[model samples]
Target: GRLIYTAGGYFRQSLSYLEAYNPSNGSWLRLADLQVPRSGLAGCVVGGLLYAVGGRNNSPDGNTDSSALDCYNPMTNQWSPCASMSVPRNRIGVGVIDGHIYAVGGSHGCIHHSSVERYEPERDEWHLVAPMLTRRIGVGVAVLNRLLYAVGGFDGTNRLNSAECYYPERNEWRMITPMNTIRSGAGVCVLHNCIYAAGGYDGQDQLNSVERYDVETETWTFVAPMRHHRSALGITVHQGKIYVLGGYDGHTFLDSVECYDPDSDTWSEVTRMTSGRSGVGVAVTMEPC
Candidate 1:
């Protein structure tokens, strides 16, 4: 069993901490809530610290909102504000490499944005990073072999199938193979040198399809589809498995969560959330709690 946290979906901007379970054991324990209740955020772990970046909550008009960075210390059960992003952002992508976080792509205000930012907790500061090659929102980001890869999202007018990667060591970006399908608000992560993108919205529809990118071959391939197709979902990796948190489907928001094991090439349903939401964020605990 493990612990998982989720932000935003349909339950009106709340965070739910749940005791992760394996099929062999069917029990759970509730944990703590997030410092802020919002969705469409990205998270990464570095040097034992978990960082959440850029997300939004709901308004009467819809789920159009924005957020700054909020961080939690699992050991202390306390949260401290980090340096504000260069621009207010939501539906952004984030990845950590060499102790630094690359926060890329997403809109600020109502406009789709390509602005990228970097954060260093040691310095307690945020820096402007190179702009992404495309302006997008609701993109998925992953880090593998020290490089951060950004995958599919909306391009203002339509959903996109494009993908790109950034090398902090070289401070440069290069286009990689595009995803087979155009989608946004998906979950992307690197497990075993393969990049996996899962569950997103395809402009007019929600998608449960999962795709993988092979680093060695630099090509996109298909993986199994999820039981539900939702966008703005938060994704995290723990113990070599991927956990998908809450997000929105086309008709309504969702609080359901799922886990995927690449080794088995399969997905298994996990415990539901205490709260329902869309555009939520999640992080694995690494603090000395």
Candidate 2:
């Protein structure tokens, strides 16, 4: 089992953790708390270091709040503050590729954004990158063959169906094939040479569809749908399985978590989390010594 931390929500929001449950022998353990607690943020892990980037934290709320970057190292079990981004953002997509952390397409709570920036921990700095072709919030991002693929989110007017991928070698973004279904608040990850997206809402309706994109063929294919329709669920691959954690069903919160084994092309239910939440941020952590 593993642990995931999520940020962002309307009310009663806080950084929360859910540990893995081994059915063979049931158990749970508490993990770390996010230093700057907020939701609608995205996260990624690189070199065993976890970075939580650009999230709306009521930072722009008033004199009482401020935006900052938080870093957590699982090896040392320590948290440290990092250089803040040039802008404050929420519902942004965070990813690590080519030794740099990318923060793209978030909102200031009032407006949707297309700002793309990169952070280098060693340089202690942030650099502006190519802005997104479309402005959106709550987007999901992943790297496939070193290129960054940005998928489904809200574009201020409504949830979007468009998809885009950036080629770092060319320093440009090209609109790839659009998602078969229009959706927002979906979770995406790249595995085994393909990108898999799971659980999100499509405007008035909630979805359980898990879609996959083949980079080699440049085609989108359908996989097994999730057990339930959910939005903003946590998705990550661990030891060859895709684990989808708690998210929203467009109404009530969810504490249910499931795992998808691509080998079997089927989903098996996993342990439920202690806290039910949606729009959570997740990053893989190194096991403690």
Candidate 3:
């Protein structure tokens, strides 16, 4: 069975919340809470285990970096710790390759990140990798054809439209044709062999605009915009369609869910969630997770 699971974001009470959504019956089920509450965590599924990595934990004392890698076993309904990341990262982008997970740029305290880390789940270890050219927060990453693409994050300096692709063989990030609009927190996904960059912050305002990059042509073209302007949104591909979940629209936390059909190049609003949130990390599992 396929299910969508959403984990911590403030709504990290900064939320330990873990819930599952069944598309078939359109139902929501609350699951176990995170052992450590956090926000801006990155979620991914591999080898039937769900991983929530690198986010920020808030306390009355102060905000602290949670570099801890938390693994959830759906069958056991429990979360366990693997190895912690060498560095603290929040709002990071993650990609999987060679059965390994890569944590990309994010923020920690006053520092924005260009640093990257790789996790070997079987060995329970983490190692550093070649860093990006610029520091990024709210970065979006998509893995396609074994190459990982990092795009549209706010560098410490400014909101960036810059895009880079990393190939494991080369172990280096190469610059690509940049997006037309400068954005941060863009929802990125790979669909139909093309990479789509969706709604995010454009420095001036939250955006509903979208862009698609053709790997073969090395160019970005305009795509239909979403009905809602969203930044720091949860985006992923499910059953061949791109789904954008709850995020902030600047004025308030959002509860909207928008689905985009690549064939028609159109977006439709789906059933809303029970509540509004932003900075939530989402993943899909074919197993019980």
lDDT for every model? 0.74, 0.74, 0.86
Writing each residue's lDDT as its tens digit, candidate 2 over 1-289 gives 3444333332345443423333334344455666665667676776677777766554344311224677777666666888988877777787788889888888774678787888888887898888888887878888878888889889899888788998877778889988887778888898899888887778888899988999888888999998978887777777678877778886677877788989889987777767777766676665543
The residue ranges of model 2 lying beyond 4 angstroms of the native Cα positions read 1-11, 16-27, 58-67
Give the TM-score ranking, best first: 3, 2, 1
My TM-score estimates for the predictions, one after another, are: 0.88, 0.90, 0.96
Worst 10 residues of 2 by lDDT: 58-67
lDDT of 3: 0.86
The segments of candidate 1 whose C-alpha lies over 4 angstroms from its true place after superposition are 8-35, 59-67
lDDT of 2 at 102: 87
Candidate 3's TM-score reads 0.96
Point out the higher-scoring one by lDDT: 2 or 3.
3
Greater TM-score among 1 and 2 belongs to 2
RMSD of each: 2.8, 2.8, 1.4
Best model per TM-score:
3
